Amino acid sequence: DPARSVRHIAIPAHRGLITDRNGEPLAVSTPVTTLWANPKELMTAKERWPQLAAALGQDTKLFADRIEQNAEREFIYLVRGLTPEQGEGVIALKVPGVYSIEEFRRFYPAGEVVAHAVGFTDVDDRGREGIELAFDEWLAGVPGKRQVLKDRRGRVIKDVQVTKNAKPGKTLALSIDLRLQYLAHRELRNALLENGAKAGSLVIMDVKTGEILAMTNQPTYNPNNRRNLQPAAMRNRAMIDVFEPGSTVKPFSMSAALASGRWKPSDIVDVYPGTLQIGRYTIRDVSRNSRQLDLTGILIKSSNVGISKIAFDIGAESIYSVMQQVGLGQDTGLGFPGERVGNLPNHRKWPKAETATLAYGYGLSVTAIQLAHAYAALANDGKSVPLSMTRVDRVPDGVQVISPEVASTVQGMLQQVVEAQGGVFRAQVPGYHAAGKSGTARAYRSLFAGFAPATDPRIAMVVVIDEPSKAGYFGGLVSAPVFSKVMAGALRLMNVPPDN
Ligand SMILES: *C(=O)[C@](C)(CC(=C)O)NC(=O)OC(C)(C)C
């Protein structure tokens, strides 16, 4: 057993600050006090152990058994993450082999409000979830190195040389606007309990820059106190969970129709008697007191029969292509942990049943992020700007995925869906023209997807509410009023001029 030893040891680096887009702190590394011990030294001072046990709130017997069972080790933790006062209280006992060191611990000042986006670090300040993990290399910095001389008990007797200084991690500014994030968090929360709903997500996106301005989910958790949390509570559902978008994808079906050369908005479809058999299967409308509807009316009344007949005429392939081009069932490139691509199925032959289901948004699966990104492209005159979770100063070129005229026509139809008699009037945003589409999917999921202001769009938004429990479960009743409140608040905070 050696009389001395020499060891190159790590100098930990200070982890980078995560901020919102305006520099509001979301994740900050602050010094906590850690007490550790060298048992080989403790073993020389047993009369001090009970005083030490007491100061640590430990039973004297269990503490003594712990030191005895570790008699051959040079390192154990006593307690991690005290205040300096708490440290100095123990250090005042002057117990041999007991030492304090300051180490960095993440604090999350907004806690539950941004937990799913920001994620968290382990006790070693390593990014283990969300942005903390996705940008770990950026935030972590580079540990330094130094050479210590240790005596026969592994006690540090000299600092010989520093070979490398630590390099701190880098500041990261998210795209999130904490002001919009708090507004969404609170409104989605108020909505959940108003409808006795299980779970929900809300996404707000900048249609010009591709930036995620808000991303909230219920349920949530306090990342500063992760003791006894539900595993459900930690899911970033907006990126992690996939659902059938139902009627919210009808604007893409319609984009394919207006692009085909075969359809204009004042064209007519006969949807009487509100059902359509195709062999074994029957397509069914919620409301079944219509015969002739124009394409705008097909959206206002959300007629499954109407969108299905259009889809038969233009063919599923045209609709599939629009949905693929606006990013449905495609990688976002965000690289967020557990992030889902979902499923936009393909066929060589599209039979009539698959053709109809695709057109009204059954048999495909998307994330809330994806559905928001598609509404952003439609709102941005058919140009998709690539998605960002980080502040965008230099906006990359977007890709024209829907012709500008077709996008402009579908925008106007979606404004009528909100503004017209029989429309989703609860989605109306006071002072503004707004546009979007309600959806309901299967126990129900309640959807609203929209953008505003209609005259020069700035913001796309998706509200998803899981299993509302009141007699009203339609997207137009459950999700639309949340869209209204949050869209109103977000446009005021962003100083967007009233267009109505
Ligand atoms: C759209 O979401 C559709 C396809 C039509 C609509 C009500 O907006 N959803 C639908 O038909 O929902 C149920 C009634 C659950 C089938």
Residue numbers in the entry: 48 to 489, 502 to 559
Text from the published report:
Due to this imminent need for new antibiotic leads, our DOS library was screened against P. aeruginosa PBP3 using the XChem platform. The core enol lactone scaffold was found to react with Ser294, the catalytic residue found within the conserved SXXK motif of the β-lactam binding pocket. Upon incubation of the compound with the crystals, resulting electron density maps suggested a linear bound compound, which was hypothesised to result from lactone ring-opening followed by enol tautomerization to afford the linear ketone derivative. In addition to the covalent bond, hydrogen bonding interactions were observed with neighbouring residues Asn351, Ser349 and Thr487. Considering these findings, it was proposed that the identified hit could be rapidly diversified through four primary vectors to comprehensively probe the PBP3 binding pocket. The 10 elaborated analogues were then screened using X-ray crystallography to validate the initial hit and observe the effects of vector derivatisation on the PBP3 binding preference. All compounds except for 8–11 were identified as PBP3 binders using this method. The hit identified against PBP3 binds through a covalent mechanism, exemplifying the utility of our library towards the discovery of novel covalent ligands, in addition to reversible binders.
The PBP family is responsible for the synthesis and cross-linking of peptidoglycan, the major component in the bacterial cell wall. The cell wall plays a pivotal role in controlling the shape and integrity of the cell and inhibition of the PBPs leads to cell lysis due to turgor pressure. The penicillin-binding domain contains a catalytic serine residue, which is vital for its function and a useful target for inhibition.
